[PDB]
Design a protein around this ligand. Structure first.
Ligand code: NHW
Ligand code: 9K2
Ligand code: 9KZ
Ligand code: CL
Ligand code: MG
Length: 385
């Protein structure tokens, strides 16, 4: 459309296409010393608030704000319902800064009505490793929409990030913005198909009756990789090598340290599920998925859809199809209703045979202050929360 805000920022124009050899900032030679030391102005009666995600009550305020005002699907059937414990995990990874968890309070109610967050990460884009901020959980209260508050939150966080001598960022959104480096459709594999029909999501007909739909999505309760088990602290070094080598093939991926592997994969109930196959004290295969429920808006019977989201999956002893079939099984054993995956990495190759259905949209991958050729989602090797 016009992108009056986005076009002031070091991002590509809607028309911009770069050749494969281009891989650099839009604006280089930035100076920490020149970064504005003042907070961006909020409109009258609003104030910046530094959230302490480790404090249960500050964390619960962020939780409420998102439970009520965060992303909905295009038909407003669903709203993401990230749990408080999930938010603690997503925001307190290694070297996180408390000052990159930025809230906005309405002074007179003392209530949180705005939020944005970033955590630091090393990102490899087209074989160049860049220290970046990963931005996530940008949210304005439904009652305050289209008032140009989002660019204030975006400018304030960019300012705080630049204070740490960091000048690039990664982010994802379902909305089209200038301009994606990659665009990945999502797919869904029904697990609790009766529930899915009942809330309006899945479709039946003459050929596909209720009983036939249930038969179609039945899984055998036996693993292809018999020894696949929950990840444990002893597996951190093994996972780090398995995953770190795997990821090198891609055009876009995080370069995880050991401390990151421990944070991002060690299992937490209702948050992150990681499974490993150990042979001879070596980790040869791994499955992971995170738990992201959606709230079901205005269904009499159900209020929550429990959804497992494919995270990182690597196999060296089975086919990728057998690995993902095990991942679906492990999601089913843990009470999930549906398993969601993007057409990143090798994922697309299994979607047909494993009975995934194509969804109604896509997740776009973005870089801030970085010029490079865009690429097909098969070359994307990072999954953001
Ligand atoms: C070097 C470090 C750099 C760090 C920074 C990196 C950049 C990080 C960027 C952030 C990454 C976040 C990633 C992330 O969190 C994951 S994507 C999820 C974003 N959150 C939601 O969708 C929750 C529901 N929606 C809302 O709360 C509001 O609709 C929000 C706050 C989204 C927009 O509030 P609003 O009341 O609806 O709108 P105004 O205040 O009037 O503002 C309109 C301006 O906002 C642009 N807009 C709309 N949605 C956007 C989105 N998802 N990203 C970026 N920009 C977005 C829009 O194009 C327009 O600019 P334009 O006029 O140019 O078109
Ligand atoms: C529905 C879905 C399925 C799937 F397998 C992977 C991703 C999505 C999805 C679609 C739109 C979204 N907007 N914001 C988010 C949250 N973040 C990832 C930032 C988001 C996620
Ligand atoms: C069958 C379940 O998967 C989905 O269709 C789904 C859900 C549950 N929540 C969402 C929340 C926000 C944006 C999109 C969403 C989509 C696409
Ligand atoms: Cl400004
Ligand atoms: Mg606004």
């Amino acid at each position: 459309i016009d992108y009056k805000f986005w076009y002031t920022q070091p991002v590509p124009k809607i028309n911009d296409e770069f050749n494969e050899s281009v891989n650099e900032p839009f604006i280089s030679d930035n100076k920490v010393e020149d970064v504005r030391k003042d907070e961006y102005k909020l409109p009258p009666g609003y104030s910046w608030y530094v959230c302490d995600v480790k404090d249960e009550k500050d964390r619960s305020e962020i939780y409420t704000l998102l439970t009520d005002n965060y992303v909905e699907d295009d038909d407003n059937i669903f709203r993401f319902n990230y749990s408080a414990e999930f938010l603690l995990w997503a925001l307190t990874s290694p070297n996180y800064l408390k000052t990159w968890h930025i809230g906005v309070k309405y002074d007179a109610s003392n209530k949180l009505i705005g939020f944005i967050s970033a955590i630091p990460t090393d990102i490899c884009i087209h074989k160049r490793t860049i220290k970046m901020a990963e931005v996530n959980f940008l949210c304005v209260h439904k009652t305050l929409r289209s008032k140009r508050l989002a660019p204030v939150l975006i400018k304030e966080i960019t300012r705080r990030i630049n204070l740490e001598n960091i000048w690039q960022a990664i982010y994802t959104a379902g909305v089209y913005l200038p301009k994606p480096v990659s665009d990945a459709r999502y797919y869904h594999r029904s697990i609790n198909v009766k529930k899915l029909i009942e809330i309006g999501f899945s479709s039946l007909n003459s050929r596909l009756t209720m009983s036939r739909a249930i038969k179609l999505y039945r899984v055998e309760d036996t693993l292809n990789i018999k020894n696949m088990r929950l990840m444990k602290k002893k597996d951190v070094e093994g996972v780090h090598k398995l995953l770190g080598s795997y990821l090198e093939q891609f055009n876009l991926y995080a370069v995880f340290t050991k401390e990151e592997i421990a944070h991002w994969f060690l299992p937490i109930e209702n948050v992150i599920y990681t499974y490993v196959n150990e042979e001879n004290g070596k980790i040869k295969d791994m499955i992971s998925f995170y738990s992201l429920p959606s709230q079901i808006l205005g269904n009499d019977k159900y209020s929550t859809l429990n959804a497992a989201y494919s995270f990182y999956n690597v196999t060296t002893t089975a086919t990728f199809k057998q690995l993902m079939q095990d991942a679906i099984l492990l999601a089913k054993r843990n009470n999930f209703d549906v398993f969601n995956a993007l057409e990143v990495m090798q994922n697309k190759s299994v979607f047909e045979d494993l009975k995934f259905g194509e969804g109604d949209g896509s997740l776009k991958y973005y870089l801030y202050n970085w010029k490079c050729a865009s690429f097909a989602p098969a070359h994307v090797g990072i999954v953001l929360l």
